[PDB]
Scaffold this active site. Structure first.
Site, PDB file in Angstrom:
ATOM      1  N   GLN A 165      27.586   0.209  38.911  1.00 43.86           N
ATOM      2  CA  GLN A 165      27.119  -1.117  38.520  1.00 43.86           C
ATOM      3  C   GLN A 165      26.036  -1.033  37.451  1.00 43.86           C
ATOM      4  O   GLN A 165      26.091  -1.746  36.441  1.00 43.86           O
ATOM      5  CB  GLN A 165      26.603  -1.883  39.737  1.00 43.86           C
ATOM      6  CG  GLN A 165      25.925  -3.198  39.372  1.00 43.86           C
ATOM      7  CD  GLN A 165      25.512  -4.008  40.584  1.00 43.86           C
ATOM      8  OE1 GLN A 165      26.318  -4.269  41.474  1.00 43.86           O
ATOM      9  NE2 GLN A 165      24.250  -4.408  40.624  1.00 43.86           N
ATOM     10  N   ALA A 166      25.039  -0.170  37.656  1.00 46.14           N
ATOM     11  CA  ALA A 166      23.931  -0.090  36.710  1.00 46.14           C
ATOM     12  C   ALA A 166      24.415   0.360  35.338  1.00 46.14           C
ATOM     13  O   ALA A 166      24.046  -0.227  34.315  1.00 46.14           O
ATOM     14  CB  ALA A 166      22.845   0.849  37.238  1.00 46.14           C
TER      15      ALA A 166
ATOM     16  N   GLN B 297      26.674  -2.617  33.707  1.00 42.70           N
ATOM     17  CA  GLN B 297      25.940  -3.797  33.265  1.00 42.70           C
ATOM     18  C   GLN B 297      24.977  -3.459  32.131  1.00 42.70           C
ATOM     19  O   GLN B 297      24.773  -4.274  31.224  1.00 42.70           O
ATOM     20  CB  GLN B 297      25.207  -4.433  34.447  1.00 42.70           C
ATOM     21  CG  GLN B 297      26.164  -5.021  35.478  1.00 42.70           C
ATOM     22  CD  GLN B 297      25.473  -5.726  36.637  1.00 42.70           C
ATOM     23  OE1 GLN B 297      26.088  -6.533  37.331  1.00 42.70           O
ATOM     24  NE2 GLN B 297      24.199  -5.414  36.860  1.00 42.70           N
TER      25      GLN B 297
ATOM     26  N   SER C 289      23.120   4.972  37.327  1.00 44.97           N
ATOM     27  CA  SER C 289      21.926   4.927  38.155  1.00 44.97           C
ATOM     28  C   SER C 289      21.765   6.234  38.923  1.00 44.97           C
ATOM     29  O   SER C 289      22.719   6.991  39.120  1.00 44.97           O
ATOM     30  CB  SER C 289      21.983   3.754  39.136  1.00 44.97           C
ATOM     31  OG  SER C 289      23.038   3.915  40.074  1.00 44.97           O
TER      32      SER C 289
ATOM     33  N   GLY D   5      22.652   4.722  43.232  1.00 41.79           N
ATOM     34  CA  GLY D   5      23.943   4.281  43.716  1.00 41.79           C
ATOM     35  C   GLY D   5      24.863   5.441  44.050  1.00 41.79           C
ATOM     36  O   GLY D   5      24.745   6.539  43.511  1.00 41.79           O
ATOM     37  N   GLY D   6      25.802   5.181  44.964  1.00 41.74           N
ATOM     38  CA  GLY D   6      26.744   6.216  45.353  1.00 41.74           C
ATOM     39  C   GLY D   6      27.677   6.614  44.225  1.00 41.74           C
ATOM     40  O   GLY D   6      27.986   7.797  44.049  1.00 41.74           O
TER      41      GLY D   6
ATOM     42  N   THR E 217      18.463  -1.185  46.322  1.00 39.84           N
ATOM     43  CA  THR E 217      19.351  -1.756  47.327  1.00 39.84           C
ATOM     44  C   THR E 217      19.700  -0.774  48.437  1.00 39.84           C
ATOM     45  O   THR E 217      20.579  -1.072  49.256  1.00 39.84           O
ATOM     46  CB  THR E 217      20.639  -2.263  46.668  1.00 39.84           C
ATOM     47  OG1 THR E 217      21.277  -1.184  45.971  1.00 39.84           O
ATOM     48  CG2 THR E 217      20.332  -3.384  45.684  1.00 39.84           C
TER      49      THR E 217
ATOM     50  N   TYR F   8      18.276  -8.402  36.908  1.00 36.64           N
ATOM     51  CA  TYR F   8      18.961  -7.333  36.187  1.00 36.64           C
ATOM     52  C   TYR F   8      19.241  -7.735  34.745  1.00 36.64           C
ATOM     53  O   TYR F   8      19.161  -6.902  33.835  1.00 36.64           O
ATOM     54  CB  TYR F   8      20.261  -6.955  36.902  1.00 36.64           C
ATOM     55  CG  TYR F   8      20.055  -6.104  38.132  1.00 36.64           C
ATOM     56  CD1 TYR F   8      19.011  -5.190  38.202  1.00 36.64           C
ATOM     57  CD2 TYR F   8      20.902  -6.215  39.228  1.00 36.64           C
ATOM     58  CE1 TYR F   8      18.817  -4.410  39.328  1.00 36.64           C
ATOM     59  CE2 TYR F   8      20.716  -5.439  40.358  1.00 36.64           C
ATOM     60  CZ  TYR F   8      19.671  -4.540  40.402  1.00 36.64           C
ATOM     61  OH  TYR F   8      19.483  -3.766  41.525  1.00 36.64           O
TER      62      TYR F   8
ATOM     63  N   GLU G 291      21.061  17.187  17.410  1.00 39.03           N
ATOM     64  CA  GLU G 291      19.696  17.097  16.907  1.00 39.03           C
ATOM     65  C   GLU G 291      18.736  16.554  17.960  1.00 39.03           C
ATOM     66  O   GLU G 291      17.537  16.849  17.906  1.00 39.03           O
ATOM     67  CB  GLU G 291      19.668  16.235  15.647  1.00 39.03           C
ATOM     68  CG  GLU G 291      18.459  16.474  14.764  1.00 39.03           C
ATOM     69  CD  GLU G 291      18.598  15.830  13.400  1.00 39.03           C
ATOM     70  OE1 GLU G 291      19.743  15.498  13.014  1.00 39.03           O
ATOM     71  OE2 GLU G 291      17.561  15.662  12.715  1.00 39.03           O
TER      72      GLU G 291
HETATM   73  N1  LIG Z   1      18.056  -1.535  35.505  1.00 39.50           N
HETATM   74  C1  LIG Z   1      19.120  -1.813  36.251  1.00 39.50           C
HETATM   75  N2  LIG Z   1      19.271  -1.198  37.471  1.00 39.50           N
HETATM   76  C2  LIG Z   1      20.346  -1.474  38.236  1.00 39.50           C
HETATM   77  C3  LIG Z   1      21.312  -2.373  37.813  1.00 39.50           C
HETATM   78  N3  LIG Z   1      22.255  -2.438  38.780  1.00 39.50           N
HETATM   79  C4  LIG Z   1      21.906  -1.609  39.790  1.00 39.50           C
HETATM   80  N4  LIG Z   1      20.717  -1.013  39.467  1.00 39.50           N
HETATM   81  C5  LIG Z   1      19.967  -0.014  40.246  1.00 39.50           C
HETATM   82  O1  LIG Z   1      20.886   0.977  40.655  1.00 39.50           O
HETATM   83  C6  LIG Z   1      20.624   1.385  41.983  1.00 39.50           C
HETATM   84  C7  LIG Z   1      21.866   1.136  42.821  1.00 39.50           C
HETATM   85  O2  LIG Z   1      22.943   1.800  42.210  1.00 39.50           O
HETATM   86  P1  LIG Z   1      24.242   1.021  41.671  1.00 39.50           P
HETATM   87  O3  LIG Z   1      24.516   1.329  40.218  1.00 39.50           O
HETATM   88  O4  LIG Z   1      24.054  -0.458  41.894  1.00 39.50           O
HETATM   89  O5  LIG Z   1      25.407   1.576  42.636  1.00 39.50           O
HETATM   90  P2  LIG Z   1      26.809   2.149  42.094  1.00 39.50           P
HETATM   91  O6  LIG Z   1      26.611   3.117  40.951  1.00 39.50           O
HETATM   92  O7  LIG Z   1      27.717   1.010  41.691  1.00 39.50           O
HETATM   93  O8  LIG Z   1      27.436   2.958  43.342  1.00 39.50           O
HETATM   94  P3  LIG Z   1      27.997   2.285  44.700  1.00 39.50           P
HETATM   95  O9  LIG Z   1      27.204   2.813  45.872  1.00 39.50           O
HETATM   96  O10 LIG Z   1      29.435   2.719  44.832  1.00 39.50           O
HETATM   97  O11 LIG Z   1      27.897   0.777  44.655  1.00 39.50           O
HETATM   98  C8  LIG Z   1      19.447   0.574  42.484  1.00 39.50           C
HETATM   99  O12 LIG Z   1      18.291   1.366  42.353  1.00 39.50           O
HETATM  100  C9  LIG Z   1      19.377  -0.590  41.522  1.00 39.50           C
HETATM  101  O13 LIG Z   1      18.049  -1.019  41.350  1.00 39.50           O
HETATM  102  C10 LIG Z   1      21.168  -3.000  36.578  1.00 39.50           C
HETATM  103  O14 LIG Z   1      22.005  -3.805  36.167  1.00 39.50           O
HETATM  104  N5  LIG Z   1      20.065  -2.712  35.806  1.00 39.50           N
HETATM  105 MG   LIG Z   2      28.575  -0.490  43.205  1.00 37.87          MG
END
Ligand SMILES: Nc1nc2c(ncn2[C@@H]2O[C@H](COP(=O)(O)OP(=O)(O)OP(=O)(O)O)[C@@H](O)[C@H]2O)c(=O)[nH]1
Ligand SMILES: [Mg+2]
Ligand SMILES: Nc1ncnc2c1ncn2[C@@H]1O[C@H](COP(=O)(O)OP(=O)(O)CP(=O)(O)O)[C@@H](O)[C@H]1O
Ligand SMILES: Nc1nc2c(ncn2[C@@H]2O[C@H](COP(=O)(O)OP(=O)(O)O)[C@@H](O)[C@H]2O)c(=O)[nH]1
Ligand SMILES: [Ca+2]
Ligand SMILES: [Ca+2]
Ligand SMILES: [Ca+2]
Ligand SMILES: [Mg+2]
Ligand SMILES: [Mg+2]
EC number: 3.6.5.-
Lengths: 423, 54, 437, 339
Positions: free
Chosen positions: C11-12, C15, C140, C143-144, C179, C224, C254
């Protein structure tokens, strides 16, 4: 499309499950006939988690109704939202279980469990990606307790990689039907220790005290008790039913809430509990939500320590002020949160409030004080078992005394496991 | 305070200013670790189904 | 011209990647339908923006990007978003159920079943490249998917593209927006297995972005969307040299040459200024001296730490806007006589400076005010090890009780991978102390 | 209701401060490893500064300045004075010192020969931070053999100011509190730790004025003043009757000048003005006075103890201007103003 299959078993399970569907159908704008008459797209965003969509834009609850007596399920079918349930999902017998765990688990229940699994299989086969199951039942009776835990075991055998979640009503001598409830509950708790990932402990002792002491009801009925359960069940499932980032499905909730596999028994809490038009501020919601008098497990959290906490706020409120009050509670009582799990309190906000409330707060705590509930049941069990009192109802169904001894030892082990992490 | 390697173009320029001089695993091995983890998942599930069969 | 492929995981990553490609299109004058009027070579070319955009015969400029997530709801935002016409479906890869904030679930269980599909879709982009530089990987730590699947992807990329460079944009976990309680586990598990596969990684602490949004943009509770608009400005500052004419950081190699003398210490600190609220009708424009001085304020860093109690190994200044070299050197000369800027003895005390005359682009209707000039400092400080210290301490607290460990073992991960990953972080934390004291 | 943690049980100053914070009913003490604190009374060695200021919704304050060790170490202070343009090698209030294990062996012997040939007094003193191990001699060959940790050799002040009756040496301790805004507060009360033996310019009892050495190796302990500690009231009265001057004019102006010079020099390096956490710190300055009423800086202590008669006043002052200024509840210091 992350679907959940709902199962309600026994008298208590079906009466509490029926009210649950009545409550959340209203929140999602689903009328008693399955037609959506809402005014917000948030209602239908994650509607498929709990509802199937049929012909004519009808929404059908993904719910399976189980009992060994027809009586209570006939009252469900005659209830307000009785026509919304899938008729083929009514699975019932005629013998009953006589408040006997052995009849639900070993004799009467085994005869009916296969036809329940046939319905579970039909719902699962039409799931895009089934998350798991939620079961509502009591532990003090026979069908919900005995057959419910048999159901859970056979569901785990066929879906070993899916989450199992239960709302389990714990018996109490204050609100009791028979003297054998401690036997039935002790036998069931060990099944839950092994075969669920998340169990909301709903203590009828706490529900009674809240109705009497707080809500000022001198003569609470089961309907009054179930009003507290409905509001609690709606709150704890808000993160599953509406868009959000935290605890959005059953598995992420378990990963956030269960640091050790056997310690997955939660104390739910709800705020407000008013005996009614006054606006409730965010500091008031936060203080009441953590107050022991708002807990549904009849355990004093100050007698133990919080492993993990989930907090959900509903309604239009200052999210900045929510963070300030949540951090205020943790920073002013940090001795009650274990220091070896950093940042173990997670907060979620949902804009849609429950029916008849501007705002509300739901509490989900994995506290070591829950051992007071299991100690309570263990004492009542032992008081009879040391004299083998009322055991003939169970040996007459094929059970041996050794199985009771092992259930006794298993729950005392569970109490000891909570005690080692409290220190 | 020396400015060296100044390169200019239409959309900007770059240079360096000095203030003081100084004083992998193979595809097979990855597949083995992924398959080893899957086998441990299969063993844990086989023990669960054995326990449920009892 | 040499192409770069962007990969966004979880997700991170997705997005943030969505926010970056929106900014790239505004910067290069690419409309949401893919058309670019200023591009006179229809259907081809080897301009600087072609390192990030390919071209179809119809004139569409398609991002060289892959989006990967184990849940479809986040990538479906890209499929129905403003810039949906940019991407073709082969670039958007989704699964059914996510990794549930579990490194082992994303790396072993689910990663094994989807890694071949991701690599195949990446191979499709690499086959369009006449000279692929390498990859930019957004994800991120917590996240998993972002932790678990990324580390598997980085391993396979080293196998299938051994000579190519790999850069990271990593989101460091912050409890104010996090989260999951187990994010310290995932952060350290993914850093251990990715450490030898990443040439240069830019960490962004969500705590820093959060406070910059509250303090400088007057956002009471940043979302976000607020965080990612700011992050995409920093990322754009870093990648601008790959997409525009220039001579500093012109290829991925570089970045390592200018910022990473020791391969394990490949986490440069990013500092950005100025961040000005768009709600201010009239803000006094900061000078070159003022925005350069702000590069040494902890309150403007992507990771909160104190560079005064560390040592520098390298330092790049990336300016955008009305900036001439004369003002840069005057600002640097003043800052040397005021700031504690200690370099290691085996490195020159200097600054590689890059200036792009086009001022920063802001998303219309966003929270960031248009400014006449801005700067991003990329400095490799040992002081960034403070973030490793914080993370490792939280790991130590939970792991001493084996809290939540059963979730990882239950996915086929051995318990020894925890201690093995922690010992690697201990060696990394020791390397910073040897270089910095 | 503010929260704090205690991580240095051996600190007599902050054991009293913690006692006062509890007596206000508005401060609650947590376990030493609880991270949800407003105030950290940290440990002396390896304080985890990198874990401070990362707790949402908590203003965190610590009782030590990260990087203040540069001022509070023997070799670090000498290196700081020589290499800082604000202080310069031409610094007139610090004795000529050298670092002996870069190294300054050949530089120390350079000026040493200029004093032997020029008939001048050539007595030096070697010391370090690993002491309770100090050697005083006029031969440089003997000083370097005692060193063979990092040691410093500075010019021993052969002409100290001697209190009468007694013909005895002393040293002045000043307590200075620097708050989170880098205000420099000088405690109005100091102490003279006096030697009880007559100063013999031709045995280290009458040359070292430490409170532990005069109580274990001196036979006249507690003769002239209680515990070999003369406070400012008696010392000022002596300067008026004997030297026809005051403590403020002859000494305290130089002391305040030295304190400002040292602390303003390292202000850019340790200030927590724009930092995610705030710091304050209590310092102990040690001064020497020669027979010309000139004040010399000897060392700066980063974890000083206080005089028994002054613990109550100073610790309360620490709570007033350093802790309650950041965390208000429901002057004994001299503010050394600066830019
Ligand atoms: N800066 C920023 N951080 C994010 C965003 N979305 C999630 N995070 C951060 O990412 C972490 C959670 O990881 P995610 O990327 O949401 O999870 P994932 O990679 O989709 O993995 P899953 O467990 O399968 O859902 C948390 O620390 C969130 O604060 C975003 O859009 N912007
Ligand atoms: Mg996710
Ligand atoms: N250059 C010098 N000339 C004369 N006397 C000196 C001197 N340097 C040190 N001394 C004497 O040595 C004594 C102790 O010196 P120093 O301050 O190094 O010991 P110390 O640091 O262990 C005491 P504290 O506990 O306050 O830190 C002082 O009282 C002082 O009188
Ligand atoms: N809260 C609540 N508890 C109930 C209800 N009905 C029964 N119980 C409790 O459940 C236990 C009896 O189990 P029951 O569900 O009636 O037996 P079953 O039909 O065989 O599963 C006792 O502890 C009762 O107090 C109900 O509607 N609400
Ligand atoms: Ca039968
Ligand atoms: Ca072209
Ligand atoms: Ca490599
Ligand atoms: Mg009944
Ligand atoms: Mg000392």
């Amino acid at each position: 499309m992350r679907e959940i299959v709902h199962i309600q078993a026994g008298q208590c399970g079906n009466q509490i499950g029926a009210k649950f569907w009545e409550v959340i159908s209203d929140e999602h704008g689903i009328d008693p006939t399955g037609s959506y008459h809402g005014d917000s797209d948030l209602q239908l965003e994650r509607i498929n988690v709990y509802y199937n969509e049929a012909t004519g834009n009808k929404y059908v609850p993904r719910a399976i109704l189980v009992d060994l007596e027809p009586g209570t399920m006939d009252s469900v079918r005659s209830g307000p939202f009785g026509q919304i349930f899938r008729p083929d999902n009514f699975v019932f017998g005629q013998s009953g279980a006589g408040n006997n765990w052995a009849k639900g688990h070993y004799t009467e229940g085994a005869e009916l469990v296969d036809s329940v699994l046939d319905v579970v299989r039909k719902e699962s086969e039409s799931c895009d990606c089934l998350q798991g199951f939620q079961l509502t039942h009591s532990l003090g009776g026979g069908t919900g307790s005995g057959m419910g835990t048999l159901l859970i075991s056979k569901i785990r055998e066929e879906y070993p990689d899916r989450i199992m979640n239960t709302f389990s009503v714990m018996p109490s001598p204050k609100v009791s039907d028979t003297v054998v409830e401690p036997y039935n509950a002790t036998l069931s708790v060990h099944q839950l220790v092994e075969n669920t990932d998340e169990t909301y402990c709903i203590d009828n002792e706490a529900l009674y005290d809240i109705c009497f002491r707080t809500l000022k009801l001198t003569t609470p009925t089961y309907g009054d008790l179930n009003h507290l359960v409905s509001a609690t069940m709606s709150g704890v499932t808000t993160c599953l039913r509406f868009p959000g980032q935290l605890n959005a499905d059953l598995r992420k909730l378990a990963v956030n809430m269960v640091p050790f596999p056997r310690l997955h028994f939660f104390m739910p809490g709800f705020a407000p509990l008013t005996s009614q038009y006054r606006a409730l501020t965010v500091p008031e919601l936060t203080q009441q939500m953590f107050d022991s008098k708002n807990m549904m497990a009849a355990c004093d959290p100050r007698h133990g320590r919080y492993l993990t906490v989930a907090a959900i706020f509903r309604g239009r409120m200052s999210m900045k002020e929510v963070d300030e009050q949540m951090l205020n509670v943790q920073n002013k009582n940090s001795s009650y949160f274990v220091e070896w799990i950093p940042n173990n309190v997670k907060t979620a906000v949902c804009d849609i409030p429950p029916r008849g409330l501007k705002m509300s707060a739901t509490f989900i705590g994995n506290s070591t004080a829950i051992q007071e509930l299991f100690k309570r049941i263990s004492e009542q069990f032992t008081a009879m078992f040391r004299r083998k009192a009322f055991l003939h109802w169970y040996t007459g169904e094929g059970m041996d005394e050794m199985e009771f001894t092992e259930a006794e030892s298993n729950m005392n082990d569970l109490v000891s496991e909570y005690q080692q992490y409290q220190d | 305070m020396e400015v060296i390697e100044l390169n200019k173009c239409t959309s900007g320029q770059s240079f360096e200013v000095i203030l003081k001089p100084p004083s992998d695993p193979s595809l097979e091995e990855i597949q083995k670790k992924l398959e080893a983890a899957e086998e441990r998942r299969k063993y844990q599930e086989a023990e669960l189904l054995k326990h449920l069969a009892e | 011209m040499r192409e770069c492929i962007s990969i966004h995981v979880g997700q991170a990553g997705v997005q943030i990647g969505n926010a970056c490609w929106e900014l790239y299109c505004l910067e290069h004058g690419i409309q949401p339908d893919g058309q670019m009027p200023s591009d006179k070579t229809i259907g081809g070319g080897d301009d600087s923006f072609n390192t990030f955009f390919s071209e179809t015969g119809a004139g569409k400029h398609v991002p060289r990007a892959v989006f990967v997530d184990l849940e479809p709801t986040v990538i479906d935002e890209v499929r129905t978003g403003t810039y949906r016409q940019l991407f073709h479906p082969e670039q958007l890869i989704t699964g059914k159920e996510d990794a549930a904030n579990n490194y082992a679930r994303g790396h072993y269980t689910i990663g094994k079943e989807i890694i071949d599909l991701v690599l195949d879709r990446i191979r499709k982009l690499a086959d369009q490249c006449t000279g692929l530089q390498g990859f930019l990987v957004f994800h991120s730590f917590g996240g998993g998917t972002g932790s678990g699947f990324t580390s598997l992807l980085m391993e396979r990329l080293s196998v299938d593209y051994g000579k190519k460079s790999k850069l990271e944009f990593s989101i460091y976990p912050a409890p104010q927006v996090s989260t999951a309680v187990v994010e310290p586990y995932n952060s350290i598990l993914t850093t251990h297995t990715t450490l030898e596969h990443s040439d240069c990684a830019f960490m962004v602490d969500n705590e820093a972005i959060y406070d910059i949004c509250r303090r400088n943009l007057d956002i009471e509770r940043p979302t976000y969307t607020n965080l990612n608009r700011l992050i995409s400005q920093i990322v754009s500052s870093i990648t601008a040299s790959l997409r525009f004419d220039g001579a500093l950081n012109v290829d991925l190699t570089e970045f390592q040459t200018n910022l990473v003398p020791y391969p394990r210490i490949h986490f440069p600190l990013a500092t950005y200024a100025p961040v000005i609220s768009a709600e201010k009708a009239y803000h006094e424009q900061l000078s070159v001296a003022e925005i350069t001085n702000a590069c040494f304020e902890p309150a403007n860093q992507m990771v909160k730490c104190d560079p005064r109690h560390g040592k520098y190994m390298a330092c790049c200044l990336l300016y955008r806007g009305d900036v001439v070299p004369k003002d840069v050197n005057a600002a640097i000369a003043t800052i040397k006589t005021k700031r504690s800027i200690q370099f290691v003895d085996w490195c020159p005390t200097g600054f590689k400076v890059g200036i792009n005359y086009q001022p920063p682009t802001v998303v219309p209707g966003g929270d960031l005010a248009k400014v006449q000039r801005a700067v991003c400092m990329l400095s490799n400080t040992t002081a960034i090890a403070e973030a490793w210290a914080r993370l490792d301490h939280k790991f130590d607290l939970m792991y001493a009780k084996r809290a939540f460990v059963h979730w990882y073992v239950g996915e086929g991960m051995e318990e020894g991978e925890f201690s093995e990953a922690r010992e690697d972080m201990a060696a990394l934390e020791k390397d910073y102390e040897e270089v910095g004291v | 209701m503010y929260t704090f943690v205690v991580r240095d049980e051996n600190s007599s100053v902050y054991a009293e401060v913690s006692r006062l914070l509890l007596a206000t009913g508005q401060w609650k003490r947590l376990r030493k490893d609880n991270p949800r604190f407003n105030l950290m009374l940290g440990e002396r060695n390896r304080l985890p500064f990198g874990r401070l200021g990362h707790e949402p919704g908590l203003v965190q304050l610590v009782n030590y300045y990260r990087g203040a060790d540069k001022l509070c170490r023997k070799a670090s202070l000498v290196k700081l004075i020589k290499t800082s343009p604000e202080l310069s090698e031409s610094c007139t209030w610090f004795p000529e010192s050298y670092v002996i294990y870069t190294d300054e062996r050949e530089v120390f012997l350079a000026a040493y020969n200029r004093r032997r040939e020029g008939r001048e007094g050539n007595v030096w003193i070697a010391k370090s931070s690993a002491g309770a191990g100090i050697l005083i001699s006029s031969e440089a060959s003997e000083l370097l053999d005692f060193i063979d940790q990092v040691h410093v050799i500075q010019k021993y002040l052969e002409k100290p100011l001697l209190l009468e009756p007694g013909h005895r040496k002393f040293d002045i301790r000043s307590w200075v509190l620097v708050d989170h805004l880098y205000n420099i507060y000088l405690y109005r009360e100091g102490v003279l730790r006096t030697s009880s033996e007559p100063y013999n310019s031709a045995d280290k009892t009458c040359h070292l004025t430490n409170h532990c050495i005069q109580k274990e190796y001196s036979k006249n302990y507690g003769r002239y003043e209680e515990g070999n500690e003369m406070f400012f009231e008696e010392f000022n009265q002596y300067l008026m009757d004997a030297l026809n001057t005051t403590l403020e004019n002859s000494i305290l102006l130089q002391i305040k000048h030295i304190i400002r010079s040292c602390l303003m020099c390292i202000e850019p390096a340790i200030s927590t003005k724009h930092l995610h956490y705030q710091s304050f710190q209590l310092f102990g300055f040690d001064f020497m006075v020669d027979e010309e009423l000139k004040v010399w800086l000897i060392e700066v202590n980063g974890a000083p103890a206080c005089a028994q008669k002054l613990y109550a006043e100073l610790c309360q002052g620490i709570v007033d201007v350093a802790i309650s200024s950041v965390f208000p509840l429901a002057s004994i210091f001299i503010k050394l103003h600066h830019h």
